[PDB]
Amino acid sequence: LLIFIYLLLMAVAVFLVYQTIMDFREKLKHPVMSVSYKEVDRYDAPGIALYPGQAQLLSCKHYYEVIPPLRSPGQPGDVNCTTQRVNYTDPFSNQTLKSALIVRGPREVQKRELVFLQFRLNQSSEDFSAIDYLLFSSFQEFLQSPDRAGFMQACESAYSSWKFSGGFRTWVKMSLVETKEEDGREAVEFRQETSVVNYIDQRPAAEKSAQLFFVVFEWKDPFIQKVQDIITANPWNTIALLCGAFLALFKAAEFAKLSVKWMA
Amino acid sequence: LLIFIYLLLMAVAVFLVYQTIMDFREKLKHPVMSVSYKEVDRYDAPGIALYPGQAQLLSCKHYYEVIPPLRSPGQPGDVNCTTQRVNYTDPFSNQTLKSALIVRGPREVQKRELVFLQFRLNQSSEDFSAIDYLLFSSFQEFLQSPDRAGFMQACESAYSSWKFSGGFRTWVKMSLVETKEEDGREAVEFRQETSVVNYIDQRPAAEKSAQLFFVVFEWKDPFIQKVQDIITANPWNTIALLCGAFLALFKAAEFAKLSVKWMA
Amino acid sequence: LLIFIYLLLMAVAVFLVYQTIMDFREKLKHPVMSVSYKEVDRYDAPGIALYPGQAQLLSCKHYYEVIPPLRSPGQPGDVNCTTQRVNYTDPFSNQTLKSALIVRGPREVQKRELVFLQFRLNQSSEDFSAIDYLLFSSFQEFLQSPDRAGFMQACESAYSSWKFSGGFRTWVKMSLVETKEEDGREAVEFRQETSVVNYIDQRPAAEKSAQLFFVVFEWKDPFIQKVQDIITANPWNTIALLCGAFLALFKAAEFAKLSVKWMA
């Protein structure tokens, strides 16, 4: 025959523990995500894996904020960069042989360094001509690799590949996104946005049968976007909250006993 | 004539309560956002509502990782998928009749299933020919609907519509984004990125007046992106924190009284 | 010769304080991001700084959800909006003079107001012709500016510039993103996604030498995306957690003493 507020206190404690456990579980289920920007003065030389079927690389150069007009739009020019060639097997199906021409991408961003590439496909029956390209983080990391074919088979799964069509000048603005996985993977990936500009075919009609591919690679900005996942569920903070609530309840019970022995 | 640290304690309590209320209010005002990825082996067959004005669907097929070259670039071919037709009214303005050709999109993603569509518009006065397309989540959810016109009028507001031009082969990479609203709406939407590739018109000059539209639909990856809003303002955690601070202040006051009766 | 649980209590307190400091440091290092959407019935009129090299603005009009077919595809039409001209210097290199044609952007989104622009470049040696465009928030904020050249030089750094090619009708869907920086900068920026549609050159072959640029500007939706960074590290919450945990440890020690004087 007392106040019996201990029952209400126990109910409050049970409810608070239950809601705290539910909150911790739902916070552990749904991590939040954070984005930051790391400014880099000079990117590492990216690798550009082009896939020309039969078109030959007429020209390739390292340009700057402007490209001078082509002296010969559709004739063999000058290749003026470090390019390699690799042959590997497509991870999707082991019955196809893929030949990749690897180009060292532009490093300088403050100066807006460009990689300008021009291919010509002489004759083909394909209705929609297009050259595929893949981007990987470092060309140097590709050079000193024991298994170049294995490197490219890994890059096929690690990165997504796009394509640029003939009759255009595809201007590819590429940027780096580093996703720091919960396992500390630090997976680096490429994002890119294009702008296709028509090619004014001024060549004589005799040579108009051949198709011309122009593509320009640069970095859109000297910022690498780092994306991380943050776990908002901290067990120790939960323990501290539970301890504080339990202490508050215990002191409330003590004050209730004091009130009972004073007035009630 | 005592220490009168109770006044400082009350000031600290008032400041802590004020800052806690402000922090809770600003956390309730700005929910955080979380992104997760759900891997699906086979997407549900999406619905592609195309809006051909007068162009007739020459061909449509379910292809795989490659498209064989067209046997007849601009002549009636074979339609080899499930297509329906609906007529409804534009939700914005009730004075226009919209006729939509609904195509069952590709399901398989591991096999890189394609939907290839080819239209031909014979003659028109339009300077810039383009066919509009809208994407909705399920074609099956469209088949068994009591009000197909109502379904399309809802799809107009629920989804965004794009267009693909003639003289190109628009390759649409489409992915699904499920935004879980605070009201548990779980609104599903489509994102898409294209790649226009020129069409090498090898048809005779007599038939070059007619315009050809080509479009390819697939899924870019087998990942549905779920975006959720997390409320970082928890009333019960706030109550526990306030209780802990109040208890700390009370025990500090008790120890101050002990110090007064000991030395001070 | 006692229980000496005080040593374990001190170790627990040290570990708890250490992990709390580490958690606070890593939370202060990595702020989370919050995204919100503010609906505006009528955007403030944006400023479109176009950079025509030698092409003259044939036509420019404020249209609505449809554009009627051009009465004269490549002849001087009617300019029917507020346009200004400014001359300034490129912030990157002070040796180039940039002439900008500032155009009054579309305000209404409910009515889907369009800005339709048509330029004609008579003769040039450029292989890939394109007109550059920059978007800034307010044209009115540009009109009453003491230093228009300084305003444009600041807009060059504050905003990113794109380009639209000839032989196309680029439809630019633009939207506003306000990033609220930690310093309360409230930096406003423009995002845009395009859709190039081929231009069917029906003009006589005599006038086909000149290149035509068409572009359409509207707002994709009446939503401004506000992106904020939230600091999850609250010093006062950490103080409350530490105080509650310290009190829990103190009461545990008191109960241990009670147990010692009772049984142990």
UniProtKB/Swiss-Prot annotation, chains A, B, C:
Residues 18-233 are extracellular. One of its GO terms (molecular function) is pH-gated chloride channel activity. The keyword Ion transport applies. It is found in: Cell membrane. One of its GO terms (biological process) is chloride transport. It catalyses: chloride(in) = chloride(out). The keyword Ion transport applies. Disulfide bonds: none annotated. One of its GO terms (cellular component) is chloride channel complex. The chain crosses the membrane at residues 1-17, 234-250. It comes from the Eukaryota. Glycans are attached at N87, N94. It is a multi-pass membrane protein. Chloride channel gated by pH that facilitates the entry of chloride ions into cells upon exposure to extracellular acidic pH. Involved in acidosis-induced cell death by mediating chloride influx and subsequent cell swelling. Belongs to the proton-activated chloride channel family. This is Proton-activated chloride channel. The chain holds residues 69 to 331 of 350 of the full protein.
